[PDB]
Amino acid sequence: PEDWGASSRTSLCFKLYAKGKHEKKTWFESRDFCRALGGDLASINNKEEQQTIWRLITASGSYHKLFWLGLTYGSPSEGFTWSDGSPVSYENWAYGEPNNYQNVEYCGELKGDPTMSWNDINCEHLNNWICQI
């Protein structure tokens, strides 16, 4: 769908998900859902993509929700990775994150407010999610 608010043209498309609580998915379920449509969980690779997603969040009127992104812990040599294979270069971790709290947080979620900050959280948490194609 045409992004009238974009400041530059791209054919890449982000889509926000989950209107109701029962729809919410684990990180793995969200990854699989987006791949079943031919894409993947969203990666956020620069500030422009972050702003594009923030436009989608405000346009959807679904505020202050948490969304799975494609962030997942890779290894000590890599740190975090994106499920779509992009290197984690741009980062927007919240203060004190990622913190692998209690040794069980290996997936990344977006706080859908103007900060657009990321936090690592347990992959089995039920969240909204963002796909990209």
Ligand SMILES: [Ca+2]
């Ligand atoms: Ca955390």
